[PDB]
Design a protein around this motif. Structure first.
Motif, PDB file in Angstrom:
ATOM      1  N   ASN A  67      37.450 -15.739  31.537  1.00 27.89           N
ATOM      2  CA  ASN A  67      36.047 -15.343  31.497  1.00 27.89           C
ATOM      3  C   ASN A  67      35.821 -13.883  31.123  1.00 27.89           C
ATOM      4  O   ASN A  67      34.690 -13.481  30.845  1.00 27.89           O
ATOM      5  CB  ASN A  67      35.380 -15.612  32.850  1.00 27.89           C
ATOM      6  CG  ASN A  67      35.401 -17.078  33.229  1.00 27.89           C
ATOM      7  OD1 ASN A  67      35.046 -17.947  32.428  1.00 27.89           O
ATOM      8  ND2 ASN A  67      35.807 -17.363  34.459  1.00 27.89           N
ATOM      9  N   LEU A 147      33.282 -14.448  40.123  1.00 27.52           N
ATOM     10  CA  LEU A 147      32.695 -14.612  38.804  1.00 27.52           C
ATOM     11  C   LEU A 147      32.721 -16.111  38.507  1.00 27.52           C
ATOM     12  O   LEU A 147      31.782 -16.658  37.918  1.00 27.52           O
ATOM     13  CB  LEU A 147      33.524 -13.875  37.754  1.00 27.52           C
ATOM     14  CG  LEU A 147      32.810 -13.247  36.553  1.00 27.52           C
ATOM     15  CD1 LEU A 147      33.810 -13.200  35.392  1.00 27.52           C
ATOM     16  CD2 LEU A 147      31.549 -14.019  36.165  1.00 27.52           C
ATOM     17  N   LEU A 151      29.536 -18.561  37.457  1.00 31.63           N
ATOM     18  CA  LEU A 151      29.457 -19.367  36.241  1.00 31.63           C
ATOM     19  C   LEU A 151      29.383 -20.856  36.551  1.00 31.63           C
ATOM     20  O   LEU A 151      28.719 -21.620  35.842  1.00 31.63           O
ATOM     21  CB  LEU A 151      30.649 -19.056  35.336  1.00 31.63           C
ATOM     22  CG  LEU A 151      30.780 -17.554  35.035  1.00 31.63           C
ATOM     23  CD1 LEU A 151      32.103 -17.271  34.347  1.00 31.63           C
ATOM     24  CD2 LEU A 151      29.602 -17.086  34.186  1.00 31.63           C
ATOM     25  N   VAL A 292      30.084 -15.755  28.215  1.00 28.72           N
ATOM     26  CA  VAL A 292      30.053 -15.042  29.485  1.00 28.72           C
ATOM     27  C   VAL A 292      29.765 -13.554  29.313  1.00 28.72           C
ATOM     28  O   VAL A 292      28.918 -13.003  30.005  1.00 28.72           O
ATOM     29  CB  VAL A 292      31.371 -15.224  30.257  1.00 28.72           C
ATOM     30  CG1 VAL A 292      31.519 -16.672  30.685  1.00 28.72           C
ATOM     31  CG2 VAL A 292      32.540 -14.830  29.389  1.00 28.72           C
ATOM     32  N   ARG A 296      26.718 -12.413  31.329  1.00 28.21           N
ATOM     33  CA  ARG A 296      27.109 -12.178  32.712  1.00 28.21           C
ATOM     34  C   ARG A 296      26.303 -11.115  33.450  1.00 28.21           C
ATOM     35  O   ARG A 296      26.094 -11.232  34.660  1.00 28.21           O
ATOM     36  CB  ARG A 296      28.609 -11.871  32.826  1.00 28.21           C
ATOM     37  CG  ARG A 296      29.059 -10.501  32.350  1.00 28.21           C
ATOM     38  CD  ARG A 296      30.455 -10.192  32.901  1.00 28.21           C
ATOM     39  NE  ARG A 296      30.984  -8.945  32.362  1.00 28.21           N
ATOM     40  CZ  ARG A 296      32.050  -8.303  32.830  1.00 28.21           C
ATOM     41  NH1 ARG A 296      32.726  -8.781  33.868  1.00 28.21           N
ATOM     42  NH2 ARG A 296      32.438  -7.168  32.258  1.00 28.21           N
TER      43      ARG A 296
END
Ligand code: TPS
Length: 308
Positions: A67, A147, A151, A292, A296
């Protein structure tokens, strides 16, 4: 004699992790002093390196993941590995000149079957259920598993993530920067569930002869993590750094991953008896490194606003 500095997270370099094993296995062969520094949690490793720049003392950063690839490469701090791709075998394949995988797994919520009788069967239920389950997870700004959950929720709720997050916040006991503290509080009884890995039960099975811990298999499927390592462009020991990356995808390394990091190896090594008790999630979920990195910051911003 020459030193090879490797930045990584605490559970990797831990006395109980794969670190000590990988270290002596690398040094016993390739003459040098492998210095594994438990410096930051997964995501933080990158942010710290981006601030050290070429002043960084690291030769290799071990512990980033699929990621963070885009974010890492756009930084320009990493050089090509010089590692043959055919040396790696990962779900969904792997084509990357810079970051070399060393293991993979699936994020999942772990619980104690002796303490939790009717665990959730989907991320949706965990978030929306009327049950007062206690949950603990990691900060997406510092931890890869954190993280990962961010996601995972995004895959499951899309634009409804914030509303879902507000509901999850009500069942949240606390949020730690790293996995280690999170898991420790869970084991101490501070929560009914903790975000961890489908392979976490294997630790308790083999090391403590206990099979009461389990990772809940959710119907939406699970998010895939492929941890990676890469050599820095500013490294003053390029050759060694690269010998470490190649040796990483080899048996001497991989053989310590199963019982060291409790993750699936990247090389076809033999999994410890006990792993077969684990559940392989049917459906695998993953965003592309580009997706991402591009979103993010906004997803994290929404997350923190919703849970605070
Ligand atoms: C019992 C048990 N279950 C799973 C694992 C694997 N694991 C724990 S944390 C992590 C990455 C953490 O990044 P961060 O430190 O930023 O949270 C990994 C791969 C383990 N070592 N022990």
């Amino acid at each position: 004699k020459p030193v090879l500095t490797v930045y990584t997270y605490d559970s990797f370099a831990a006395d109980w992790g794969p670190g000590p094993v990988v270290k002596k296995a690398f040094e016993a062969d390739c003459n040098c002093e492998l210095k594994l520094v438990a410096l930051e949690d997964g995501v933080s490793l990158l942010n710290r390196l981006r601030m050290e720049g070429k002043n960084s003392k690291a030769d290799v950063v071990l512990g980033l993941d699929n990621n963070l690839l885009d974010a890492a490469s756009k930084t320009g701090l990493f050089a090509k590995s010089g590692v043959a791709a055919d040396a790696v075998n990962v779900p969904g394949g792997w084509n990357n000149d810079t970051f070399v995988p060393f293991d993979y797994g699936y994020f999942a919520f772990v619980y104690d079957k002796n303490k939790l009788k009717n665990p959730p069967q989907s991320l949706k239920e965990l978030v929306e259920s009327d049950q007062n389950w206690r949950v603990i997870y990691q900060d997406p700004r510092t931890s890869t598993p954190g993280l990962g959950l961010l996601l995972w929720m995004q895959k499951v709720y899309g634009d409804d993530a914030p509303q879902a997050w507000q509901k999850l916040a009500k069942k949240t006991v606390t949020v730690t920067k790293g996995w280690s503290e999170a898991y420790g509080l869970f084991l101490k009884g501070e929560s009914d569930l903790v975000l961890s890995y489908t392979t976490s039960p294997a630790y308790h099975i083999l090391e403590e002869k206990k099979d009461n811990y389990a990772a809940a298999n959710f119907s939406e499927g699970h998010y895939l993590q492929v941890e990676v390592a890469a050599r820095t462009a500013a490294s003053k020991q390029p050759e060694l750094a690269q010998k470490f990356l190649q040796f990483m995808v080899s048996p001497a390394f991989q053989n310590a991953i199963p019982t060291g990091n409790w993750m699936y190896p990247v090389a076809n090594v033999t999994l410890p008896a006990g792993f077969e008790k684990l559940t392989k999630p049917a459906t695998t979920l993953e965003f592309t490194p580009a997706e991402v990195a591009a979103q993010r910051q906004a997803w994290i911003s929404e997350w923190q606003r919703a849970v605070s």
